[PDB]
Design a protein around this ligand. Structure first.
Ligand SMILES: [Mg+2]
Ligand SMILES: [Mg+2]
Ligand SMILES: [Mg+2]
Ligand SMILES: [Mg+2]
Ligand SMILES: [Mg+2]
Ligand SMILES: [Mg+2]
Ligand SMILES: [Mg+2]
Ligand SMILES: [Mg+2]
Ligand SMILES: [Mg+2]
Ligand SMILES: [Mg+2]
Ligand SMILES: [Mg+2]
Ligand SMILES: [Mg+2]
Lengths: 107, 203, 173, 191, 48, 100, 196, 141
RNA sequence: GCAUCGGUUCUGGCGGGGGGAUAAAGGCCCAGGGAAUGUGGCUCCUCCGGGAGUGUUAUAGCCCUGGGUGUAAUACCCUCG
RNA sequence: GCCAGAACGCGACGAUACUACCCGCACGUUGUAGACGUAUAAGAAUAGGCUCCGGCCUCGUAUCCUAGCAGGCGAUUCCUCCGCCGGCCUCGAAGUGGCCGUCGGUAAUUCGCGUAUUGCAAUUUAGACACGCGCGGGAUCAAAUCCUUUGCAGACGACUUAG
């Protein structure tokens, strides 16, 4: 009886902030999308929405789960890593945490 | 690229520094890694070169109190690899400590990671990285010569696990033969329409 | 760099005492025509009493390889400056064009004698028409009869983003 | 310079078989069987004729090509040891003290053992154990001679070298004190 | 500057943690190497 | 918020007039305030919640449009099951590579 | 090495039971009461299971043995318990030997013999806090030394800027664990021998 | 003299050897330049298999088991094409296992969403019979 | 959130035009001349793959030169959208 | 060999009153360096291997699984897979898997009713690790320290003993 999954997003990992060797800039983040390994592949995901989903302590308005929303802005480097801009910068304790790259602005 | 729950790396045939670099990058990216058979890792160059490097390492020690602060020289092959990885990890931060906690290293193949799929890293494999004819040594041999005390125990346990794996492999071959026979027999009972459709689709 | 042979023809500025001055032609291997003209003026300063300020460039043309799809043996006579003197040496290359031979020459000189572009003078580049005038063993073994060889211990091509592999690769293809 | 091809050939006489698998050479003939692991050298073996083994190195440098003739000679030595064997003859030399030599085969192991006494007149008895497969005997043909015979030239010569090195004079003019056991003849058991 | 007259150091660093023993009863840190050909036998005892 | 696949369903039997009158601007939101008010009156005053009643006009238009559409869909062997089954991403599914 | 399991005898004496207690006088002395039932339940099935496990897996076999301190003139009643390795034979032989020795006395002439060279392990005589002169055997400073002559004059140079671990310092002396070796047994005398 | 040698047997870089390039096209070798480069051309009528005459670096090429026999060294495009058609290189390549694998990869990449759903359904239908046969074989032991 | 715009900007394709040896090449069609890492033949040897010699297209081909299709394509640089 | 023993390294064993231990559910006020199909054991060589012995090996670009109200109800038809508990038999590198049964659910085929209104998107609150609890039972009825004492010890703590 429906042994299938329900995933409609591509998974990614929050690698770091945009930075030099010593100076970091939290306003944009670096995202590694699964299976995206070049700029040509990364171009498909430009403009796609991204959610960082985490859990908090208090239940505020029917849930303990909070979301930070952003979108993919441009590719980064040559290996498919992308730059993402969120409404607020990501917590920076989430370096290595998972994010969901939606398909909401499709085609 | 693919995100796994945990990646088990069979350390045999890998170059220590390159595997350490790859593993450190994965750990900082958030991947969990278990490296087995750290005594079968390889270092390029002569074993005399490796031994001289470790002797130079051993010479370092805090002068005023060798029980604190000084470089603590770990003899086991998994600990040699762990030192190599910690060199590439920013271990003095909380983020680096978490990255290192995402890692496990062992000599031989302990039972949990026995009966599990062990990956390889082609960017660090000796056969793919070293010119044939160049000298190389074994981290297990270096550890044994610098004071690691369990080379023979690991060898005996690996022999036992390889005998068990040989029995498994025999039953696996039997299962493969039976599955091939089953597919051949069922090829005459499925719809030819289904068969042609799958063949056209590429299956 | 990626070079191209240029025919550069230059001239001393015509004067009342010397109308219609002699035209001097050189073959210059340069990445572009600016460098070609610069090298022409450098060599013309070396050889004759003409400068860029007292002369002009009559013509600059590209000399394309006439048979770039034919394998040839090339002999290059060159003069170069080491750290402790100047030397002349003759080397051989196996290429399909004079430009490719010169590029291989530059790379080989840089690799074997640490000779930079600034310290090499290409005296002559000649296509060796025959086979018995090939003098170097490393070209002779390439022009050996019925030549064939395998490619042992060849590393397969694996994407650098495929970090982990489920089976051990083979080096037999 | 890297040479495109370096080739060498070994003829195999009719009475012996040779098997090469994973660069592990096995040679079997009338006098026995020998094995040699050559996996440390990148060489390509093949059968070029009915009874000729070809061994080649492709795109090798001088250092790599230098090992081709070494491998040929080693495999040829294995073949001649398997067919005809190897025999080394040593001579005892001394000025005043007769060197006493006693050779016996161990009971618990197949190895031979040689004890040397009265070397330069000192009381220590020096004992050297031969490599397996090497037989030692006192020469019945002439006095003060040792005969070492075997299938492997490497083992025979190494046992002889052990015997030779175990008898040395120290803190003396070696130009004057010549006592020792020295290898005198190298040859084959047959012919 | 160098020590004027040479002399060996006082005491041994091989017993260096000159602390109270952790336990009153002596500890056998190593037992004689086993040999299966020999008859079964105890390797130690206690007394006062 | 949709992904357009390459499968096209035939539409010869569908009522274009019905489609346009459904496409009229006020079709979906004209009654919405009243339905929300009725739902609130049911929930707050009542003790147990019940399904919002579907408008008769909307049900009639649904049936009228869907009849010929289903008839057309049945002519493709597995299209009905394909439309009945949901879509999800499996392991190794790469949306930048999948043709859809 | 690691201990896979240990098997105990059915009955333990109060001498050895005292070793498991700090306040034996006011305790309920229940040390091995539940364990003793295993010899009666299922005809010692668990005991046999553990012995078979030791036979199957373990490569080192030791016996747990205790002293009969009540036979000494000592005022102590709490016995001393330790592991003694069985050497020789197979693991099955070791297990059989140890099991046959259960709650049984072994005499020291069955372990050692005359003219044997043995080792003695013990904690040395304890001195309290002791200065460097006796603790390390350093030279006494001259008589006219101010602020004490029973010291080390220089406890370190300048540049390392720390007192080093190799410098003699006052502290605990004696009461150290020592394994003295190569002691000859001159006689093993018997208690019942009136002329030992 | 019995000789058992079990060393590897590579395919040789030689005149007439057909190489498969990274883009999927085929080129016969007409002349060896050096240890690492050759001169090659694919005069195939099928545009998916044809390559222009030029230098091929051996690192970007794979050696197919097809060798055009008695191909002259340095032969021009016309002679190479004549030998290519005479030997029937396209048919032999199509029969090779590499071409079949490439065709299967192309077919699997060309699937749509409906195609993938139908593939799942048909694979389940075939798997039913496969499982029945496997259970029967297991029961027979 | 979407649609339609404006400013800045990053990035991917598509259609054209010009120049150079009016690219050089190359594919076919001729006209001439050559050689070898010499094809077919011929001689000898090897019968065990094959090797050696002779000689210029034959039962493969290649190189050089002058032409035609031809203001061919291409790719390079520039440029209009 | 010998000395120390990580005071945030590990093992075996003994007794464990109680709020401590064991069994089932009943929630979760509480936490997580971060589930979303968290699916895949040969060993070995890489100048060689695998095999069902016919043949295969650049390529995990693979294999498995994957449809149904977040997955309903009832048929047709299926004997194929998933689990739940119980015999057992083997699993010591840091305790593992199995074939033998019960009990459930189960599109390989075809259908018949239900889905709407969450209003054009808004994490898909869905998992396993826990941890602290209350139900209502079983099991069990303990130690340690202070204190007095000893001197194999000791500046005081500590330690060896005895009560
Ligand atoms: Mg030291
Ligand atoms: Mg510390
Ligand atoms: Mg003298
Ligand atoms: Mg003294
Ligand atoms: Mg004074
Ligand atoms: Mg705009
Ligand atoms: Mg001829
Ligand atoms: Mg025209
Ligand atoms: Mg044109
Ligand atoms: Mg501790
Ligand atoms: Mg059932
Ligand atoms: Mg005292």
């Amino acid at each position: 009886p429906s042994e299938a999954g329900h995933r409609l997003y591509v998974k990614g990992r929050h690698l770091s902030y945009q930075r030099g060797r010593r100076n970091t800039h939290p306003k944009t983040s670096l995202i590694k999308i699964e299976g995206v390994d070049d700029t040509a592949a990364a171009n498909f995901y430009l403009g796609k929405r991204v959610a960082y989903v985490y859990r908090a302590q208090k239940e505020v308005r029917g849930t303990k789960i909070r979301v930070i929303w952003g979108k993919i802005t441009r590719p980064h480097g040559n290996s498919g890593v992308v730059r993402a801009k969120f409404t607020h910068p990501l917590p920076a304790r989430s370096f290595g945490a998972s994010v969901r790259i939606m398909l909401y602005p499709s085609s | 690229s693919s995100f796994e729950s945990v990646v088990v790396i069979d350390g045999k045939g890998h170059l220590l520094g390159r595997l350490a670099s790859i593993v450190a990058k994965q750990l900082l990216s958030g991947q969990k890694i278990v490296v087995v058979r750290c005594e079968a890792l390889n270092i390029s160059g002569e074993f005399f070169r490796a031994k001289l490097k470790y002797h130079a390492y051993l010479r370092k020690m805090t002068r005023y109190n060798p029980t604190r602060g000084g470089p603590f020289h770990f003899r086991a092959p998994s600990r040699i690899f762990y030192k190599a990885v910690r060199g590439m990890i920013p271990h003095k931060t909380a983020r680096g400590a978490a990255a290192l906690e995402r890692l496990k290293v062992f000599e031989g193949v302990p039972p949990p990671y026995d009966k599990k799929k062990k990956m390889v890293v082609p960017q660090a494999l000796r056969v793919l990285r070293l010119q044939p004819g160049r000298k190389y040594c074994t981290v297990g041999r270096l550890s044994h010569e610098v004071g690691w005390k369990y080379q023979d125990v690991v060898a005996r346990l690996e022999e036992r696990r390889k005998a068990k794996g040989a029995a498994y492999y025999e039953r696996k071959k039997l299962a493969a033969r039976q599955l091939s026979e089953a597919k051949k027999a069922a090829a005459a009972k499925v719809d030819p329409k289904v068969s042609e459709a799958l063949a056209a689709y590429g299956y | 760099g990626r070079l191209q042979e240029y025919q550069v023809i230059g001239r001393h500025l015509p004067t009342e005492a010397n109308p219609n001055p002699a035209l001097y032609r050189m073959r210059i291997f340069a990445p572009n025509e600016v460098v070609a003209k610069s090298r022409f003026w450098y060599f013309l300063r070396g050889l004759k009493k003409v400068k860029k300020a007292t002369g002009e460039i009559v013509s600059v043309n590209v000399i394309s390889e006439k048979h770039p799809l034919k394998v040839k043996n090339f002999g290059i006579w060159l003069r170069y400056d080491s750290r402790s003197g100047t030397h002349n040496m003759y080397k051989e290359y196996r290429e399909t064009s004079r430009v490719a031979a010169v590029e291989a020459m530059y790379a080989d000189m840089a690799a074997r004698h640490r000779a930079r572009f600034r310290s090499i003078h290409i005296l002559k580049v000649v296509e060796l028409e025959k086979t018995e005038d090939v003098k170097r063993p490393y070209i002779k073994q390439l022009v050996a009869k019925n030549l064939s060889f395998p490619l042992p211990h060849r590393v397969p091509k694996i994407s650098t983003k495929k970090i982990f592999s489920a089976k051990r690769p083979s080096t037999f293809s | 310079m890297r040479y495109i091809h370096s080739e060498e050939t070994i003829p195999v006489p009719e009475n012996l078989k040779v098997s090469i698998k994973s660069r592990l050479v096995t040679v079997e003939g009338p006098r026995g069987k020998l094995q040699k692991d050559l996996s440390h050298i990148a060489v390509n073996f093949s059968v070029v004729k009915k009874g000729v083994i070809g061994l080649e190195i492709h795109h090798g440098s001088r250092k790599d090509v230098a090992a081709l003739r070494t491998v040929r000679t080693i495999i040829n030595n294995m073949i001649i040891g398997v067919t005809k064997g190897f025999k080394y003859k040593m001579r005892y030399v001394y000025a005043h003290f007769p060197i006493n030599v006693n050779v016996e085969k161990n009971a618990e192991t197949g190895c031979y053992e040689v004890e040397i006494r009265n070397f330069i007149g000192e009381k220590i008895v020096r004992k050297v154990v031969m490599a397996p497969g090497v037989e030692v005997e006192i020469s019945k043909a002439q006095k003060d001679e040792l005969i070492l015979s075997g299938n492997s030239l490497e083992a025979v010569s190494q046992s002889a070298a052990d015997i030779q090195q175990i008898c040395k004079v120290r803190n003396k003019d070696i130009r004057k004190f010549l006592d020792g056991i020295y290898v005198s003849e190298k040859g084959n058991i047959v012919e | 500057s160098h020590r004027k007259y040479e002399a060996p150091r006082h005491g041994s660093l091989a017993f260096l943690p000159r602390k109270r023993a952790a336990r009153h009863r002596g500890r056998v840190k190593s037992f004689p190497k086993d040999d299966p050909k020999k008859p079964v036998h105890l390797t130690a005892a206690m007394g006062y | 918020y949709v992904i357009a696949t390459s499968v096209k369903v035939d539409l010869t039997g569908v009522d274009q007039a019905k489609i346009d009158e459904v496409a009229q601007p006020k079709y979906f939101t004209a009654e919405k305030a009243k339905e929300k008010a009725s739902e609130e009156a049911f929930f707050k005053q009542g003790e147990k919640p019940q399904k919002k009643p579907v408008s008769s006009t909307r049900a009639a238009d649904q049936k009228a449009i869907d009849k010929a559409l289903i008839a057309n869909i049945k002519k493709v062997d597995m299209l009905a099951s394909y439309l009945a089954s949901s879509f999800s991403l499996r392991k190794g599914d790469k949306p930048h590579l999948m043709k859809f | 090495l690691r201990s896979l399991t240990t098997v105990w005898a059915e009955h333990l004496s109060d001498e050895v039971k005292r070793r498991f207690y700090k306040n034996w006088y006011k305790s309920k002395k229940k040390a091995f009461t539940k364990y003793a039932k295993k010899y009666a339940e299922n005809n010692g099935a668990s005991i046999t299971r553990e012995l078979e496990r030791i036979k199957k897996y373990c490569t080192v076999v030791r016996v747990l043995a205790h002293t009969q301190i009540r036979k000494t003139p000592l005022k102590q009643k709490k016995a001393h318990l330790m592991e003694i390795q069985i050497n020789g034979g197979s693991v099955a032989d070791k297990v059989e030997f140890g099991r046959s020795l259960f709650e049984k006395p072994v005499t020291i002439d069955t372990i050692f013999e005359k003219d044997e060279m043995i080792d003695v392990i013990a904690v040395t005589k304890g001195h309290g806090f002791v200065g460097v002169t006796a603790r390390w055997g350093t030279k006494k400073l001259p008589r006219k030394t101010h602020k004490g002559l029973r010291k080390v004059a220089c406890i370190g140079a300048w540049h390392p800027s720390h007192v080093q671990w190799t410098v003699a310092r006052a502290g605990q002396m004696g009461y150290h664990h020592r394994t003295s070796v190569n002691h000859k047994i001159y006689r093993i005398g018997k208690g019942d021998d009136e002329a030992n | 003299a019995e000789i058992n040698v079990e060393a590897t047997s590579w395919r040789r870089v030689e005149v007439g050897r057909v190489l498969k390039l990274e883009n999927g096209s085929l080129a016969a070798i007409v002349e060896i330049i050096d240890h690492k480069r050759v001169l090659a051309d694919g005069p195939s009528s099928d545009p998916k298999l044809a390559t222009p005459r030029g230098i091929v670096p051996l690192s970007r090429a794979l050696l197919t088991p097809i060798v055009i026999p008695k191909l002259p060294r340095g032969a021009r495009t016309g002679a190479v094409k004549k030998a290519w058609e005479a030997y029937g290189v396209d048919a032999k390549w199509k029969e090779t296992n590499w071409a079949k694998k490439q065709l299967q990869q192309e077919r699997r990449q060309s699937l749509t969403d409906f195609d993938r759903f139908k593939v799942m359904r048909l694979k389940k239908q075939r798997r039913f019979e496969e499982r029945k046969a496997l259970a029967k074989i297991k029961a027979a032991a």
